[PDB]
Amino acid sequence: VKDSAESLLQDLNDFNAFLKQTAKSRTENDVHKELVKKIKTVVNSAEDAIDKFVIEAKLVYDVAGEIKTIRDKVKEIRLNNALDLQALQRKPPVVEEDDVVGFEEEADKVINRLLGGSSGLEVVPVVGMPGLGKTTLANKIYKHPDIGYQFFTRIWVYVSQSYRRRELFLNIISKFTRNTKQYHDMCEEDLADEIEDFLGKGGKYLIVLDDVWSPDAWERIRIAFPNNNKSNRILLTTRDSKVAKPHDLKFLTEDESWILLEKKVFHELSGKSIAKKCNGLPLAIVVIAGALIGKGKTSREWKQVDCNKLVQLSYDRLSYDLKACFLYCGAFPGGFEIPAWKLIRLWIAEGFISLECKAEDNLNDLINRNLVMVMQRTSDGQIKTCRLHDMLHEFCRQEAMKEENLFQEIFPGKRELATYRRLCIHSSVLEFISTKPSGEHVRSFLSFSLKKIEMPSVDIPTIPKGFPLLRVFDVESINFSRFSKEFFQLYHLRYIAFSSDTIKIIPKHIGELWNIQTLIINTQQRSLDIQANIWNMERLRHLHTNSSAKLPVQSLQTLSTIAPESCTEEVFARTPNLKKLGIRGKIAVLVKKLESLENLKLINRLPPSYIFPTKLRKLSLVDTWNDMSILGQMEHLEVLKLKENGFMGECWESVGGFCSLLVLWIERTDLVSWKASADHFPRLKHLVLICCIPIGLADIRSFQVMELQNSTKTAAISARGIRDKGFKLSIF
Amino acid sequence: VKDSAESLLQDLNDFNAFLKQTAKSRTENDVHKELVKKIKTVVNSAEDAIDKFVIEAKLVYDVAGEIKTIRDKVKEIRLNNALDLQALQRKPPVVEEDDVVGFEEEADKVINRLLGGSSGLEVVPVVGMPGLGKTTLANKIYKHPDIGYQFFTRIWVYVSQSYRRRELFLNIISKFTRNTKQYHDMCEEDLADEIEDFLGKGGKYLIVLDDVWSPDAWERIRIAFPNNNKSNRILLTTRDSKVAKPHDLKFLTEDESWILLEKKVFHELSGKSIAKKCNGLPLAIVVIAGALIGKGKTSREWKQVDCNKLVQLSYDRLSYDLKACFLYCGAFPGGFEIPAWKLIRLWIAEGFISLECKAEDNLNDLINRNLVMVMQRTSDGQIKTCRLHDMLHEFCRQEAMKEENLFQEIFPGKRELATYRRLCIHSSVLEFISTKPSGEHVRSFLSFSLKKIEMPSVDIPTIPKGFPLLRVFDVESINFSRFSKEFFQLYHLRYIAFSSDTIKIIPKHIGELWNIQTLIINTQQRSLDIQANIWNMERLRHLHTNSSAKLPVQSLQTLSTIAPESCTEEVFARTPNLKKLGIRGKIAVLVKKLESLENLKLINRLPPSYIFPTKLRKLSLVDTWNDMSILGQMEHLEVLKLKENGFMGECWESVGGFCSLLVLWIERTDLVSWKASADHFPRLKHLVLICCIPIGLADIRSFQVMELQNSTKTAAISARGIRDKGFKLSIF
Ligand SMILES: Nc1ncnc2c1ncn2[C@@H]1O[C@H](COP(=O)(O)OP(=O)(O)OP(=O)(O)O)[C@@H](O)[C@H]1O
Ligand SMILES: Nc1ncnc2c1ncn2[C@@H]1O[C@H](COP(=O)(O)OP(=O)(O)OP(=O)(O)O)[C@@H](O)[C@H]1O
């Protein structure tokens, strides 16, 4: 059976290489698409069989039969479709010029940015979502009367993914001379020099480089534009934020969306609801208006209404792994606030992806390409939450549900569920669960709902029974009263995330699951006792709990909210690579050996400063004023968060030197008198005071962002005075 | 056998994908055509075998043998014709300039539309049927003396499905300059700008954009035409109505058709009959005249007479499913008024295609492309009936009967009937039935005849016997005295539509057919008792009866003319998705729980307005005046039809406020005095009074269509006065 496993592994590797090769091009051939789907199904079957054999080897007849039948299927596919297997390995946009809604103020903003500045060649980059309207705004600015009056020469160059520098340079030359047959033998650099002479002969010039996709194209084309100490400007529209390094183009409002839809259809509650569902994207409004123009003007045909090639331009530029990472963001429901940490852990568990660094790099790559929107950011600048735009969400859902079978949103029949690979259900979870589903190839069970669900006791073991091959089990919105004997049979589990109301103890049978990477226990009990062999899990990396978990007496990276009785030297000696640590166990009971620790959280007198780790970067104290001199000696502390009565006192005088502090966060304190000088916070950048101000922080060079919340008006006056003395101040 | 069924399903899926791929291109290779026919036959055989196995599993040796032989045939086809399987995956029109008949008034109409209007660039779109004569009319206008005198510049641009913008722009440029070698390096946008200056140098210009097929081409080409506040005009001819959003070109009359045929043949009763059969299409007249010019001028050779590539241009632009939907319209006999609801239900049952929304979208797509003609429209603007033009009817019949075998019109022998898939017989039904036909692969039995046929008792079970695989059974023109035991063996039935004269009860064995989607019972009895398990039919959606059906004590959408004794809470609790409901059961005997209901029909004192459903959009009362104040409180009612003594009274004073009403229909009433004001009908648009007028409706902004019928001349005078005070009034 082992040699059969090796042969099946070789077949699966060749099929995976074929799938990776065919993903480089989109095929419209239906036979090729069907063959690709068949090959993907066989690949999934082979993966499941190999994982089953691996689990049995770690711990057989049915496994052998499955391996034989999958090998036979592979041979049949190779023999039958050999020829198909071998065969499977410029229009500038027309934008609106007459009825442009909402861009009247953004156009003036960009124009005033173009008409003002230094005397050098400056660039005004416009970045935005696919179909946001960057070309429309660039055209409105390009044909504006003020721009035409100020700029003697205006040139519109349409760059794209595919362009020829010689063709572009000869197109630019034709705007100045008609005898372009004299350049048939000059090189592209001589063409650029000729363009430089042409542009320098006149006055100021404005150049619109539309749809720049890489900095390489920008550098190659820029050699034709002189910098002759005149206020020459370049207007650049791009999807990627890297090419702009800007002006982030706005979204249309609800009223503007309705205005655009009404103008496009008619040169109504149903119409207003249709325009509201486009989320301020003019491309969606245009597409839906083109669809509505063909239907009759009847309220019943507009209630039935309640593109794809433009998005594919940026989706086809993603790598093979980044495409699967991007499509997995469509599993989260529409408008959902995706937690970045949860998304990263899910990506690592699904096998798409230190691994955390690569996953954060993938998320930042998706954000830079404007495929993912950021809303919440951490105080230190990291991303906290994100979401997909509704058109991007629809694209991801359609692609991953139809063409890739990455996941299926849920009722499917017994024949349909046998082909599903991942399940995402957030509505009518109990109704689907009561049907007793059974999927032998389902690898993930996702349930992202913000409403808590209590799982009936009679239905407790249905998911571990019907889906025994689960690798990801994210049911943190479902309360599990108890664990059945079938949960411990999920030997393939890598990501487990459950919520509970009465689970005060983790059984030792959890340690029988040696594939666990992330163990998230969201319980409302005050204390939790983890009896499972945490240290015997060789693949465990993160352990998140919201209670005071008590660990039993290398790859581990996070130990969130453990009890201080579990802060022994023996326990900390088993986790040399720990980076984030939290304690929520009556701090008064009590980490030096953790030389890689960066995040520390204590939730409820400070010891000498030499006891705390010297490499700590972020420290947060919750429910625990002159004691801050101990935290001042921390030479590497950069973020300090005080939440929920973290530091209580009346008078605080700044004495210690926070040589590395960048963010100071104080929440729910009784501080009355605070005296400080610029010397005590040399590197301060971020200051947040919520539900709580010496004028010495205006002398700080790095102080640029200050956040204020509800408090006495004297604090608001002090903040306003500090702002008067770019600074960002917000008071609420 | 189950695994054999899965393997056959995989083979059928691959063959279906191949058939979908080859449908994208028309092949003239006879070997390829024969191979495609063979593959289609094998696909049909596999489908029948799989459905037989599914029925048997729901409820065997012969099924296994058939599956074996079909799989062997699939392997043989794959092995023998592998190379053939792998291989299977600009002329502007010349139109008549001398002898153009019938267009003398249409040309003047379009010219007066061109010569009059605003000072902006306006478009006069000419939409029409394939071969209607749009290009001929455009050429007649283009060369008209008045057009030539008024327009200094006239340009004829021939757009088509395949065009190059650079080539078109260089062709337009050549009309102004002969040195076109100076534009060899300018981009298409610079070419459009050059054309803009060329057109703006002179005066008014007329441009004829012939054969525009998509709005994208219109938008791409329009960038070359300036709008310089001169009365510049664009004449556009297209087949699709979407590109015009017009001028619907007329059809030639019978006399004009005969004139054209006589002019074309001779530079007769048989000639007049030939010209009459062209249905006013000049293309058909031209083709038949070219055919007749070769024959001798003998009355016997003209009585023997009693194109295709032009229609294929619009047929090849249809999707794969829309092609089958279009060809199915050719099943209905020539000149037949196809009921839209019946067509949609037939499309859903045949598997071509909520499903009703998609089917209505398909019908509207066919109509917009001018492939289907609309005659009868519902009072609210929906389509009621339609038909195919005789040339499209012939095209659909020929294509679906020869190249696709979609259906066969009927006598065929036992060998020929074994290959037929669908049967359409409307003439000599009894003669064909008496022959005892037997088709093992026939899936549909269509009989669309307007003359009623009584079915002999001895011939009752012949159709369920000879055609046991029936999925669609549309014999609503045939009266069935009783149901034989073979009818209940039609387990594959999805669409059953029969007419009867003495069937007063539906047997419980109908519920044994669980595949039924539409159940139409057209009986002449006053009352009907449905004993079949309607609620056990999980796939049933529509139930249309013309009698007072008595239902027995989710997918259901229509319950037409049920008895009010069947309007219980229990019955209405089983149909939460019902949208259309009718009752014809002595209304005096008696729906709130139906929160999705839109259509309500009561056929024979109103209860308080809070009892009726709040989401009702259309309500019709038949045989049931101050009580209309109850209907006025309906905030969402838009269509109100009163037919056959619906509202009887002498004096009616408008009190209630119809805030949402758009159509008011009153038929066969004794109303004498009617007083109303504009406030009581704020949104009224349509008013119909048949076989039955305050001047307060002229103040209604939305009142644009009023229909009148036979009545006293005082009503006609009132209607004429209202019209005097665009409004559409018709009095008969
Ligand atoms: N403010 C607006 N008013 C009217 N139409 C608009 C507006 N913004 C965009 N559109 C229209 O919606 C579509 C958006 O395409 P556009 O070229 O403006 O987007 P883009 O930002 O350049 O996107 P892409 O990255 O795909 O090039 C076009 O058809 C454009 O005419
Ligand atoms: N009124 C007419 N009198 C004489 N011949 C006509 C008339 N109308 C059309 N024809 C002729 O019949 C044929 C119809 O083709 P025509 O180009 O006029 O149609 P069309 O509306 O442009 O169709 P298509 O959509 O296929 O382009 C041509 O041969 C044309 O010369």
TrEMBL record, chains A, B:
**Which keywords describe this protein according to UniProt?**
ATP-binding, Leucine-rich repeat, Nucleotide-binding, Plant defense, Repeat
One Gene Ontology term from the biological process aspect of the record: defense response to virus
Q: What is the lineage of its organism?
A: Eukaryota, Viridiplantae, Streptophyta, Embryophyta, Tracheophyta
Its source organism is: Nicotiana benthamiana
Q: What family is this?
A: Belongs to the disease resistance NB-LRR family.
**Positions of ADP binding:** 99, 101, 131, 133-136, 389
Q: What is this protein called?
A: NRC2a
Q: Where is the Disease resistance R13L4/SHOC-2-like LRR domain?
A: 441-690
Q: Does the keyword Nucleotide-binding apply?
A: yes
